[PDB]
């Protein structure tokens, strides 16, 4: 959650810095896989946080991350 | 060469915006009325509930 919410901190700030055109035309394409519903108000932490998809399970993430052959797994 | 690549970046940006304009125009604008009734029905539910919570 520290990383996940740190990422939310960056993305909301980026959306504020860039114009609303760039939000739909550049930043939103990156966020579509991790969002349940594409909301243009993602500059607000509450908006982004509530539209996030579920994270990868820690256990599953760790199994993959900890595997010595991680490259061949992916 | 610096200007040659910059022209490509700027042209790619125009292609991107044009595509997104295509997407925004190709998709039908959602009826605010249709979503607004969905909001109003939920606003009635929220208030009816808040009364129940207060009780």
């Amino acid at each position: 959650l520290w990383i996940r919410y740190g990422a939310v901190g960056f993305i909301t700030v980026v959306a504020r810095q860039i114009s609303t055109a760039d939000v739909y035309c550049k930043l939103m394409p990156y966020l579509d896989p991790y969002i349940t519903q594409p909301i243009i108000q993602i500059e607000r932490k509450l908006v982004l946080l509530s539209v996030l998809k579920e994270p990868v399970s820690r256990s599953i993430f760790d199994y993959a991350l900890r595997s010595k052959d991680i490259t061949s797994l992916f | 060469d610096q200007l040659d690549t910059q022209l490509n970046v700027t042209e790619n940006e125009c292609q991107n915006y044009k595509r997104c304009l295509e997407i925004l125009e190709q998709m039908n604008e959602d009826d605010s009325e249709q979503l607004q009734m969905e909001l109003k029905e939920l606003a009635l539910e929220e208030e009816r509930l808040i009364q129940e919570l207060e009780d």
Binding site: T20, A21, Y24, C25 | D4, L7, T10, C14, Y17, L21
Partner: peptide, 29 residues
């Protein structure tokens, strides 16, 4: 390439002119 440096600088203004034009077109949608 044989397109001169001066002519390419003109096309840069043309592409940008359309770039900001497409941005305002985006905000309308």
């Amino acid at each position: 390439d044989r397109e001169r440096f001066i002519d390419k600088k003109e096309r840069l203004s043309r592409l940008k002119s359309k770039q900001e034009e497409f941005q305002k077109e985006v905000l309308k949608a």
